[PDB]
TrEMBL record, chain A:
<comment type="function">
    <text>Component of immature procapsids, which is cleaved into capsid proteins VP4 and VP2 after maturation. Allows the capsid to remain inactive before the maturation step.</text>
</comment>
<feature type="domain" description="Picornavirus capsid">
    <location>
        <begin position="15"/>
        <end position="214"/>
    </location>
</feature>
<comment type="function">
    <text>Lies on the inner surface of the capsid shell. After binding to the host receptor, the capsid undergoes conformational changes. Capsid protein VP4 is released, Capsid protein VP1 N-terminus is externalized, and together, they shape a pore in the host membrane through which the viral genome is translocated into the host cell cytoplasm.</text>
</comment>
<protein>
    <recommendedName>
        <fullName>Genome polyprotein</fullName>
    </recommendedName>
</protein>
<comment type="subunit">
    <text>Interacts with capsid protein VP1 and capsid protein VP3 to form heterotrimeric protomers.</text>
</comment>
<comment type="similarity">
    <text>Belongs to the picornaviruses polyprotein family.</text>
</comment>
UniProtKB/TrEMBL annotation, chains B, D, F:
<comment type="function">
    <text>Protein 2B: Plays an essential role in the virus replication cycle by acting as a viroporin. Creates a pore in the host reticulum endoplasmic and as a consequence releases Ca2+ in the cytoplasm of infected cell. In turn, high levels of cytoplasmic calcium may trigger membrane trafficking and transport of viral ER-associated proteins to viroplasms, sites of viral genome replication.</text>
</comment>
<comment type="similarity">
    <text>Belongs to the picornaviruses polyprotein family.</text>
</comment>
<protein>
    <recommendedName>
        <fullName>Genome polyprotein</fullName>
    </recommendedName>
</protein>
<comment type="function">
    <text>Capsid protein VP1: Forms an icosahedral capsid of pseudo T=3 symmetry with capsid proteins VP2 and VP3. The capsid is 300 Angstroms in diameter, composed of 60 copies of each capsid protein and enclosing the viral positive strand RNA genome. Capsid protein VP1 mainly forms the vertices of the capsid. Capsid protein VP1 interacts with host cell receptor to provide virion attachment to target host cells. This attachment induces virion internalization. Tyrosine kinases are probably involved in the entry process. After binding to its receptor, the capsid undergoes conformational changes.</text>
</comment>
<comment type="subunit">
    <text>Capsid protein VP1: Interacts with capsid protein VP0, and capsid protein VP3 to form heterotrimeric protomers. Five protomers subsequently associate to form pentamers which serve as building blocks for the capsid. Interacts with capsid protein VP2, capsid protein VP3 and capsid protein VP4 following cleavage of capsid protein VP0.</text>
</comment>
<comment type="subunit">
    <text>Interacts with RNA-directed RNA polymerase.</text>
</comment>
Automatic annotation (TrEMBL), chain C:
<comment type="subunit">
    <text>Interacts with capsid protein VP1 and capsid protein VP3 to form heterotrimeric protomers.</text>
</comment>
<feature type="domain" description="Picornavirus capsid VP1">
    <location>
        <begin position="49"/>
        <end position="265"/>
    </location>
</feature>
<comment type="similarity">
    <text>Belongs to the picornaviruses polyprotein family.</text>
</comment>
<comment type="function">
    <text>Lies on the inner surface of the capsid shell. After binding to the host receptor, the capsid undergoes conformational changes. Capsid protein VP4 is released, Capsid protein VP1 N-terminus is externalized, and together, they shape a pore in the host membrane through which the viral genome is translocated into the host cell cytoplasm.</text>
</comment>
<comment type="function">
    <text>Component of immature procapsids, which is cleaved into capsid proteins VP4 and VP2 after maturation. Allows the capsid to remain inactive before the maturation step.</text>
</comment>
<protein>
    <recommendedName>
        <fullName>Genome polyprotein</fullName>
    </recommendedName>
</protein>
Length: 245, 58, 297, 58, 50, 58
């Protein structure tokens, strides 16, 4: 009674037969903002099922020489659904998340992925290599949407911080002998009770193969990874025209 | 006793033992903190906890 | 006026933060209990699943035969109070007579404590910090020589006018806080509050502060939190004329009443710039040192 | 306790929380003031007050 | 004179022979009881593990 | 009164009379020690003690 899970939120439902468990981030469940903590006087709209539901972004292919990918939140859902219109039409935003990563393979494949949630994953540059240039990353690479961006130097996570110590944040491991899902439930993390979804990204989702995928030819060489994510306890406030960026 | 409660821990569960000669509480000493830990928050952050003896995957 | 059942039975508006955890007192290290041999089936405390993302709940009472040890080791030195209440260098300002940096008897230094690697890496272990502080100004000559000179240490918050010269009218410090000192006297030392508009400082801001299109022209804004820009610290030689003693002011900051949230991986690569986690991609170094073989030490 | 009541607020409704090491009260600290406001004195100084809902000119 | 807990909580010196068994009287052969049809799941008395 | 018991005699039978203006007890004065002697430990460390009058070798 642990390797099976049914995540039901809204009009969506994910079944799993080869789960590990559910991680709840920093031991806090997602919630709404108190009256003590709030400052804005406007009454926020709390749409409970039209945005709190599972969305499915795109697929990335785990090849042999794959290095890793990251997805910035909530940039993934600003052009997608009733969530991504309210985020455009409003100035503020506050939601938790339930991330779900799927990678199914046989009992003759092997490999491991680290699926980590790093708050405030600020991106660095190679400084031209020499270290002389104070270069900055482009908007394509800082906020890449739902198609994600691949890491060039995954040992340092493209920020100068090591992959080894990333298990101090939230994480699960997708070991193809043991599991094919990873469920992480994230609360809202910010110094502020509310912030804008289009300028500030609250956290990043790292997917890194620590162990390389291996199979003997004859098997299926195409092993996708699909990110599936639900907002939770979402709140919006400050209504004006729709702006994309 | 008459002094502004204006330190960066006023509104925290932890209580301090400070010295101050001013009315501004942020001028006080660092003091002694409370010895309270929460390793379960980072090390076992699971919805369904499992015991030491229990093999976790049934 | 709630009538339907789809809103009476709702959890919307539940502001209480439901936590799975509970902080318990740990003044000393955990004691050890006496353990014996176990020769049974079903219970296997050594076999784990790191795939769950949790850590091992194992003991040494379950894995070896142990004795009762009463641990009287204190956990009081790993507090943030003890780890951060240690005054470190955060800045260094030079007031030379000639040159290129500050040859006109005054110098402004925008507050960032991310110019020296020893205190930066220690705060960049966390993502959010809320603390009071204690700054300390150790002024002297390049040679270390102490001289009879009077200085003015003005704090210029944001919005307030920065001084353009030594004889500027912002030095009158009518509402701005200032400090006057002689260098024959001890170092100055002021205590500071938590002065940000937010509930905490944050050394990593994943986003842009301004709205609008984000091009290569104004790409330097990436990562800039104005909730951390507490302003400018200015310093002059109090006078209507040129001094004759060159000076160097060193700033030493000590935290108090510290709280911190969301630990991060500690940096293993060398810093290159301020408020910027860039690295030299050509010379990537491992976070340890190497061997030649895994079987030979 | 034995000291001249000779500050510029002796004879004021507000009470202070001061420190002094002399007999002259004007040497004491600025202290904490009382947090009492009277915005009605400058902002609604009318003989016949009117409510928010009431359109004032009948 | 035993003071530490590593010797109070000990099983050293346990001379009693701990047995899993018990000899019971069997003067006659075991009798047979009446049995019927079973058409159920979960219980399989014919499948063993040697 | 609120201070860490962190001197090198905390856990000693002897009690001190110290002055301190900090929370660290190792900063306190040396104080007055207790006047207690044990010369029998070095000077007559025998299993079978014998008296002054008793010629020891019987
Ligand atoms: C009389 C002179 C007094 C000087 C007082 C200076 C006030 C400084 C308050 C501490 C500010 C914390 C450090 C600032 C934030 C970060 O280091 C950077 N701005 C962001 O990377």
């Amino acid at each position: 009674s642990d390797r099976v899970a049914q995540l039901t939120i809204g009009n969506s439902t994910i079944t799993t037969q080869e789960a590990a468990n559910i991680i709840v981030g920093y031991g806090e469940w997602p919630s709404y903002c108190s009256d003590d903590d709030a400052t804005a006087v406007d009454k926020p709209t709390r749409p409970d099922v039209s945005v709190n539901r599972f969305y499915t972004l795109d697929t990335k292919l785990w090849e042999k020489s794959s290095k890793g990918w990251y997805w910035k939140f909530p940039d993934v859902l600003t052009e997608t659904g009733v969530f991504g219109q309210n985020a455009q039409f409003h100035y503020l935003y506050r939601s938790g998340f339930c991330i779900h990563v799927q990678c199914n393979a046989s009992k003759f494949h092997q490999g491991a992925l680290l699926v980590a949630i790093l708050p405030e994953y600020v991106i660095g540059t190679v400084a031209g290599g020499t270290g002389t240039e104070d270069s900055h990353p482009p908007y394509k690479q800082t906020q890449p949407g739902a198609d994600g961006f691949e890491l060039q130097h995954p040992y340092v996570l493209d920020a100068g911080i090591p992959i080894s110590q990333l298990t101090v944040c939230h994480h699960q491991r997708i070991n193809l002998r043991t599991n094919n899902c990873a469920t992480i439930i994230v609360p809202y993390m910010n110094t502020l009770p509310f912030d804008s979804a289009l300028n500030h990204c609250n956290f990043g989702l790292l997917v890194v193969p620590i162990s390389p995928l291996d199979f003997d030819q004859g098997a299926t060489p195409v092993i996708p990874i699909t990110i599936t994510l639900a907002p939770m306890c979402s709140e919006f406030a400050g209504l004006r025209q729709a702006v994309t960026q | 006793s008459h002094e502004n409660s204006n330190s960066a821990t006023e509104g925290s569960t932890i209580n301090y033992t400070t010295i101050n000669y001013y009315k501004d509480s942020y001028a006080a000493t660092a003091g002694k903190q409370s010895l309270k830990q929460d390793p379960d928050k980072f090390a076992n952050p699971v919805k369904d906890i499992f015991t030491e003896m229990a093999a976790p995957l049934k | 006026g709630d009538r339907v059942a789809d809103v009476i039975e709702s959890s919307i508006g539940d502001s209480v933060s439901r936590a799975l955890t509970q902080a318990l007192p740990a003044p000393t290290g955990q004691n050890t209990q006496v353990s014996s041999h176990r020769l049974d089936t079903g219970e296997v405390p050594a076999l784990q699943a790191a795939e769950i993302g949790a850590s091992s709940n194992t003991s040494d009472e379950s894995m070896i035969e142990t004795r009762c040890v009463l641990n009287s080791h204190s956990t009081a030195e790993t507090t943030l109070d003890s780890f951060f209440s240690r005054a470190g260098l955060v800045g260094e300002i030079d007031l030379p007579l000639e040159g290129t940096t500050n040859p006109n008897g005054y110098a402004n230094w925008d507050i960032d404590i991310t110019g020296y690697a020893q205190m930066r890496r220690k705060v960049e272990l966390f993502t959010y910090m809320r603390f009071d502080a204690e700054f300390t100004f150790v002024a002297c000559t390049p040679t270390g020589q102490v001289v009879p000179q009077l200085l003015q240490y003005m704090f210029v918050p944001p919005g307030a006018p920065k001084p353009e010269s030594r004889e500027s009218l912002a030095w009158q410090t009518a509402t701005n806080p200032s400090v006057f000192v002689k260098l024959t006297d001890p170092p100055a030392q002021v205590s500071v509050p938590f002065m940000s508009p937010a509930s905490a400082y944050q050394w990593f801001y994943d986003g842009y502060p301004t709205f609008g299109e984000h091009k290569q022209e104004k790409d330097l804004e990436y990562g800039a939190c104005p909730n951390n820009m507490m302003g400018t610290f200015s310093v002059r030689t109090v006078g209507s004329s040129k001094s004759k003693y060159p000076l160097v002011v060193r700033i030493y900051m000590r935290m108090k009443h510290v709280r911190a949230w969301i630990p991060r991986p500690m940096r293993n690569q060398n810093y290159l710039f301020k408020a910027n986690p860039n690295y030299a991609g050509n010379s990537i170094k491992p976070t340890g040192t190497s061997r030649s073989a895994i079987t030979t030490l």
